[PDB]
Amino acid sequence: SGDLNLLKSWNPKLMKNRKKVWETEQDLITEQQKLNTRLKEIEKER
Amino acid sequence: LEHTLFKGTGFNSWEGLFWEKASGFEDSMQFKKLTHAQRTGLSQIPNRRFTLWWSPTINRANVYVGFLVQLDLTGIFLHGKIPTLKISLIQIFRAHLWQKIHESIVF
Amino acid sequence: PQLEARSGAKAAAYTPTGIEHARLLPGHTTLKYRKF
Amino acid sequence: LGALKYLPHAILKLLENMPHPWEQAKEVKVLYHTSGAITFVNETPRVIEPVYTA
Amino acid sequence: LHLDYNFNLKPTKTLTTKERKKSRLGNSFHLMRELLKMMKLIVDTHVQFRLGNVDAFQLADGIHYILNHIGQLTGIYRYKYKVMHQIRACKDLKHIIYYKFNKNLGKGPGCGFWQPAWRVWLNFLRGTIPLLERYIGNLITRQFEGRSNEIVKTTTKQRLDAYYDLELRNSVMDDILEMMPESIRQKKARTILQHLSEAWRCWKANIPWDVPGMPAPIKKIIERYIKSKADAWVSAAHYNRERIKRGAHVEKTMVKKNLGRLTRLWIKNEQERQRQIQKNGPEITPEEATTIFSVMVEWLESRSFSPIPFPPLTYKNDTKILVLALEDLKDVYASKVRLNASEREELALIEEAYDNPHDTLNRIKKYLLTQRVFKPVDITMMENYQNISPVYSVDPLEKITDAYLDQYLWYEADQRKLFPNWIKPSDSE
Amino acid sequence: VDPNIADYITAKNNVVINFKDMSHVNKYGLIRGLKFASFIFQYYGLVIDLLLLG
Amino acid sequence: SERKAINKYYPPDYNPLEAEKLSRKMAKKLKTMNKSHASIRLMTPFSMRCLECNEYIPKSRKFNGKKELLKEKYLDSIKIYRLTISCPRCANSIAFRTDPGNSDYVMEVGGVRN
Amino acid sequence: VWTNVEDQILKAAVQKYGTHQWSKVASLLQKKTARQSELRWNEYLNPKLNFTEFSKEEDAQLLDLARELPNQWRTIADMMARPAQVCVERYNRLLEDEEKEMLAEARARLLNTQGKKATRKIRERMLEESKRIAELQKRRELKQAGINVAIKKPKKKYGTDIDYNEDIVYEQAPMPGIYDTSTEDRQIKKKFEQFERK
Amino acid sequence: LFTYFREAIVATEPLLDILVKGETRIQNRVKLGLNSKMPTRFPPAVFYTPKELGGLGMISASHILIPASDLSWSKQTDTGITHFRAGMTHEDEKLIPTIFRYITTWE
Amino acid sequence: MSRNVDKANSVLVRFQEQQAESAGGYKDYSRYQRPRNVSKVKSIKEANEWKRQVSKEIKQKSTRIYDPSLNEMQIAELNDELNNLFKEWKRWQWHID
Amino acid sequence: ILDLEELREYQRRKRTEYEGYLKRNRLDMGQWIRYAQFEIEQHDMRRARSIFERALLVDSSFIPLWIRYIDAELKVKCINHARNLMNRAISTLPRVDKLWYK
Amino acid sequence: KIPAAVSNWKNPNGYTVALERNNTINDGFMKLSEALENADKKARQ
RNA sequence: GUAUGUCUAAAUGCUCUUAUUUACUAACAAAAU
Structure with missing residues (x-):
């Protein structure tokens, strides 16, 4: 075999980890969007 | 299904069930190379899970010559050393799960 | 390195081990002979 | 430790002497190392063939 | 326990x-x-x-x-x-x-x-x-x-080859010792061994192993032993191949070795053939060649074949042709997930071409015009277990050009009726 | 074909073949692998066919 | 006795829950398990220079590192790790972090990427 | 595209490595490719190739060849003893930081006849030596107290080559045997006692 | 294999034999993974069941009752289809369909 | 549980150790960390063991600090570590008995 | 190398190293002579003598070893032993010129 | 005396070294050409 | 195939958290329509 790190959890370049990260971002991002819009609305009202 | 562990999952019926569903994953999918967005629409069924799925046929009582070991801290007989199956079983019944189940039932 | 070629083999005699080798087991006790 | 050599022989002997279902308990001849290391059932169980069959 | x-x-x-x-x-x-x-x-x-x-x-x-x-x-x-x-x-x-x-x-x-x-x-x-x-x-x-003190046994598949090699080396050393006087010969033994190894390598490659300082006799002896090795090796390889063909408990590693060794042998043979050709002219006698040419000309005349010109800049379907070629190239990779560096480079090139069709076409044309010297074609041979085939891997940059040519020339032929009805593989059936 | 094209083809066939550590100039005989080679092969075979027929 | 061993022998009195509890009680006291910088084997993705003795440890070179958890996570629920290494020649502690925002690593006062 | 420093490095590597080992060399030159490197070497670097021009006769010969082996150009080159591209041309006729860093790397490589096992072993030896000296120092420090030097722990019944005398071969009892030898030995040994004392 | 010579397979017995063998080998590969190959522990369920019910989803051409014949009179002289040979496995009267019957013969 | 440490601190092993401690009195004073505050150790044997362990540690420290790359900062750090160890040892030689 | 014990430790180590090198390349004969020299330096004449003998046993047909041994014997003004050694050498190998000359 | 050869494939020590690493062709190769060119000319004319 | 080597003088109970893993190992093997 060649590159060992590819068979590690901690390795971020491992695909599973990347996927997890994306998911985290996606959820968090969505939340931000939800809140961001609200904030914008509030600003407009003001 | 009756061959498989399907009934052990505790679902009513095989309609609208799938594997490895997850979320959509395309925007951050340009790290790959001539993969055509997704490599295969077909589910790969990694054999660790395959064994588990067909565990109730693969491990079974009508065996020819399997030395029936009782698995560690569980009531799950293995008729011979079958490789991935055992690991899967252990994972399932981690942290003395069998005992917990039994005791829970009793309670 | 130690991946190394060589100079000579060996032949040194110790006390026999008394181990029951598989091949050493008896077989063809009868020796044949010629006619004369 | 030495006796492992003959333990399979011993096993074979004992098994051979298995009391048959028409027999509550068989007495059997026994050799045994005075050290207590191994015990051979010594007798070899012979029968009157027709009688045995019956 | x-x-x-x-x-x-x-x-x-x-x-x-x-x-x-x-x-x-x-x-x-x-x-x-x-x-x-x-x-x-x-x-x-x-x-x-x-x-x-x-x-x-x-x-x-x-x-x-x-x-x-x-x-x-x-x-x-x-x-x-x-x-x-x-x-x-x-x-x-x-x-x-x-x-x-x-x-x-x-x-x-x-x-x-x-x-x-x-x-x-x-x-x-x-x-x-x-x-x-x-x-x-x-x-x-x-x-x-x-x-x-246990004694290992070379009748084992493993360790056999190494042992054999060692034995050969020993024999060679003995021969050299026999040959001439020396003072502090141990040091020289190593050198001799090295020389032998080099010779073997050369043989494997089909490089002539000519060293000037090597004295005739020693050199001769070394040559003889490498010949012997080859004889032992080639025969062994053949045997292995035969076994493989049958289906007779071949080791994966062993099979791989056979594939490699056999490939090497094939290559050697090819180069020998080439050398022979160089030495003694082409197999085709000139008169025969001339006759063939004449026949071809006659055929062309009969067919009234308009010869295929060099691709103009403002050719009608040039871009389309290029696109087709690109697609074909992609279809080598579009399937596979893994890509080596060369493959990656090729992909990149293809992408560039796609982006900038006119430029790429021009480049191709230029190459066609001028480029008469090319990068060297590395060959792997594939293990179709009955009989190994060659695989000629051309350089990514030239490869595109080649593809384009293939696309174009074939199209031209189709248009102009170069190939008659009877040559069927070319046909779409 | 255009003489230039022909020249290109011929040179292209005439390459340095490599393999691991050995390499040789392919001074004679068409290389099958290179993309256009198929066409060339077909053309060659046409000649053969013609010869066969008359 | 064999790596694929199905069942490890337990004593005749082994209340598993009780055993676990006991272990826990004797885990705070324990030397290993109650510590940071637990070992790991890893190849080096960055391909970098050891800052002390300028030893050019290249890509994919294997080392027995120490992985430790960084308490300050990335975003919220995706951990990041310090991955200690030693340079071959001089024994300077190189390390790096795995910030997953870029799908890559960050150097941590050890060496420099090049 | 090929820079001159890089070319030089490649040449150096080839003398260090081997004209049939184009992976290591490629690695050494971060931008250029393995299969490309070899090609480059073939083209420019190898001295036996006569990249320089030649007389009119040679040119004439080349042109003749070109006529009579229609642009079979590698073959022509081979015949000449010349490189190909150059021959073809003749026929037709009739950043800094990176450099610094790469050079440094390359230099380190080519010079150092080392790796894992070579570097490790010497280092280990050095460490051992250091340990030994530390031990000696410690004993010196605690000299007024009686202290014994620790022996190398045995692994599977070996000899400590101070005592016992190792596998002795005889003096071989000869004919002109004289007994002064023993005396001489004794005399020699007397001196070493004195040395020990001081 | 089958799409290329759809009609022409049926007649050649050697090819059929190879298919049977090849298929079996493939099956055993999977069973090699599971470190057994006990014929009961792999009922055809686990192989031929599609991936959409967790199986491997092989596409058998092995469960055919192969034409046997008088090998005395087969290579020699003339032939007719008499005496079928076993085909590939023990079955639970589970007639696994064969890819050939889902491919339209070339003529 | 690759690399041995995991195996050592696997639950079964721990349980075994506990059992040993209970019945017969096998402790491994290597295995547990030595306590910070002495005078929470009424037994003498335990104290002695702890002292021994600390001595061993000190010795280990000593062995390494005379290595050839003397100018490196690790050695310097250890010098303080060594001192600390010595202090600990001294403390362990308390005068209750 | 201050004390006697230290010297012993050093010397012992050296001897061990020499042994190790021998065990692999017993048939070397450069190593053996080096070892002998070391022994001589250490002023353990017995040990040196033994080493030389061992070397000879390994490779009797090696004149350099013989000559060095002779020199060593002579160096320590131990002539009679040296003479004996020379005689032995002569007996072993007549048709080598050098021993006789020596 | 035999030289100290240096391998183009192997350097155990990595010890660098200062670069230590027929024209007539058969009648055919001219004759063939003559046949060909001449033939071509004939075809043309 | 879960590497390895040196190094060794002779606070008590309590409970609560889980639909997981700071998990570790890579010796093993590597393809498409």
Whole structure:
């Protein structure tokens, strides 16, 4: 075999980890969007 | 299904069930190379899970010559050393799960 | 390195081990002979 | 430790002497190392063939 | 490793690796354990019977079960898998006996009649007695007095080749020693060995191994031994190939070696052929060639073939052709997920071409015009196990051009009727 | 074909073949692998066909 | 005795829950398990220079590192790790972090990427 | 595209490595490719190739060849003993930081006849030596107290080559045997006692 | 194999034999992974069941009752389809369909 | 549980150790960390063991700090570590008995 | 190398090293002579003598070893032993010129 | 005396070294050409 | 195939958290329509 790190959890370049990260971002991002819009609305009202 | 562990999952019926569903994953999918967005629409069924799925046929009582070991801290007989199956079983019944189940039932 | 070629083999005699080798087991006790 | 050599022989002997279902308990001849290391059932169980069959 | 009183051995903790290494018992000890377990099982049943725990009939049945189920009840077969025969026999007996015994009577447990099974097991044990006495006895001897100087054996598939090589080297050294006087020859031996190795390498490559300082005799001797090696090697390779063709227990590694070696041989042959050609002109005599040319010309005239021109800049379907070529190229990679560096480069090039069609076309044209010297074509050969094929991997940059040419020329032919009706593979059927 | 094109083809066939450590200039005989080679092969075979027929 | 061993022997009195509890009680006292910088084997993805002795440890070179958890996570629920290494020649502690925002690593006062 | 420093490095590597080992060399030159490297070497670097021009006769010969082996140009080159591209041309006729860093790397490589096992072993030896000296120092420090030097722990029944005398071969009892030898030996040994004392 | 010579397979017995063998080998590969190959522990369920019910989803051409014949009179002289040979496995009267019957013969 | 440490601190092993401690009195004073505040150790044997352990540690420290690359900062750090160890040892030689 | 014990430790180590090198390349004969020299330096004449003998046994047909040994014997003004050695050498190998000359 | 050869494939020590690493063709190769060119000319004319 | 080597003088109970893993090992193997 060649590159060992590819068979590690901690390795971020491992695909599973990347996927997890994306998911985290996606959820968090969505939340931000939800809140961001609200904030914008509030600003407009003001 | 009756061959498989399907009934052990505790679902009513095989309609609208799938594997490895997850979320959509395309925007951050340009790290790959001539993969055509997704490599295969077909589910790969990694054999660790395959064994588990067909565990109730693969491990079974009508065996020819399997030395029936009782698995560690569980009531799950293995008729011979079958490789991935055992690991899967252990994972399932981690942290003395069998005992917990039994005791829970009793309670 | 130690991946190394060589100079000579060996032949040194110790006390026999008394181990029951598989091949050493008896077989063809009868020796044949010629006619004369 | 030495006796492992003959333990399979011993096993074979004992098994051979298995009391048959028409027999509550068989007495059997026994050799045994005075050290207590191994015990051979010594007798070899012979029968009157027709009688045995019956 | 703790023994149950039922003889099922298993470990207390999870063993570290050193411990594991120390404590892997082998085919003797395990067999013995299995035997003991079996004994216990029959003995245990009788004990139970003696005690008020179980009826006589029940005891009999238990015994029968044990004897048939040896296979399931306890691993002997694991350690010695000719006990499998015995197991099979027992099963057969059960099948027979049960069918005889449950004729008018129905299916259920409670069939005694352990006799034939018992007999079978006894007979099996007979064989073991000897094997165990050699094995277990040997083990105990080792434990008391553990071997001095074992001798490995080159009749093994593994280690054979290396051993052979070593022997050859030794022989060569001996020959060289015989040849001429030396002072501090040990140092020189190494040098000689190195030289030999180099020669061998050259032979493998098909490089002529000419060194100026090498004196005639020594050099000659080295050459002879490399020839010998080749003879031994080539023949061996051939044998391996034959085996592969048959389907005769070839080692994966061995097969790979054969594929490689055979490829090398093929290459060597090719270059020899080339050399021969260079030496003694083409096989085709000039007159014959001329005649052929004339014939071709005549054919062309008959067909009234408009010769294919060089691609103009403002050719009608040029871009389309290029696109087609690009697509084709992609279709080499679009499937596979893995890509080496060269492949990646090729992909990049293709992408660039796609982006900038006009530029790429121009470049291609330029290449066609000017480029008469090219990058070297590396060849792998593939293992179609019957017969190996070559694979010529052309450089990514030139490859595109080649593809384009293929696309264009074929199209032109189709348009203009170069190939007649009868040459069928080219056709779309 | 255009003489230039022909020249290009011929040179292209006439390459340095490599393999591991050995390499050789392919001074004679068409290389099958290179993309256009198929066309060339076909053309060659046409000649053969013609010869066969008359 | 064999790596694929199905069942490890337990004593005849082994209340598993109780055993676990006991272990826990004797885990705070324990030397290993109650510590940071637990070992790991890893190849080096960055391909970098050891800052002390300028030893050019290249890509994919294997080392027995120490992985430790960084308490300050990335975003919220995706951990990041310090991965200690030693340079071959001089024994300077190189390390790096795995910030997964870029799908790559960050150097941590050890060496420099090049 | 090929820079001159890089070319030089490649050449150096080839003398260090081997004209049939184009992976290591490629690695050494971070931007250029393995299969490309070899090609480059073939083209420019190898001295036996006569990249320089030649007389009119040679040119004439080349042109003749071109006529009579229609642009079979590698073959022509081979015949000449010349490189190909150059021959073809003749026929037709009739950043800094990176450099610094790469050079440094390359230099380190080519010079150092080392790796894992070579570097490790020497280092280990050095460490051992250091340990030994530390031990000696410690004993010196605690000299007023009686102290014994620790022996190398045995692994499987070996000899400590101070005592016992190792596998002795005889003096071989000869004919002109004289007994002064023993005396001489004794005398020699007397001196070493004195040395020990001081 | 089958799409290329759809019609022309049926007649050649050697090819059929190879298919049977090849298929079996493939099956055993999977069973090699599971470190057994006990014929009961792999009922055709686990192989031929599609991936959409967790199986491997093989596409058998092995469960055909192969034409046997008088090998005395087969290579020699003339032939007719008499005596079928076993085909590939023990079945639970589970007639696994064969890819050929889902491919339209070339004629 | 690759690399041995995991195996050592696997639950079964721990349980075994506990059992040993209970019955017969096998402790491994290597295995547990030595306590910070002495005078929470009424037994003498335990104290002695602890002292021994600390001595061993000190010795280990000493062995390494005379290595050839003397100018490196690790050695310097250890010098303080060594001092600390010495202090600990001294403390362990308390005068209750 | 301050004390006697230290010297012993050093010397012992050296001897061990020499042994190790020998065990692999027993048939070397450069190593053996080096070892002999070391022994001589250490002023253990016995040891040196033994080493030389061992070397000779390994390779009797090696004049350099013989000559060096002779030199060593002579160096320590131990002439009679040296003479004996020379005689032995002569007996072993007449048709080598050098021993006789020596 | 035999030289100290240096391998183009192997350097155990990595010890660098200062670069230590027929024209007539058969009648055919001219004759063939003559046949060909001449033939071409004939075809043209 | 879960590497390895040196190094060794002779606070008590309590409970609560889980639909997981700071998990570790890579010796093993590597393809498409």
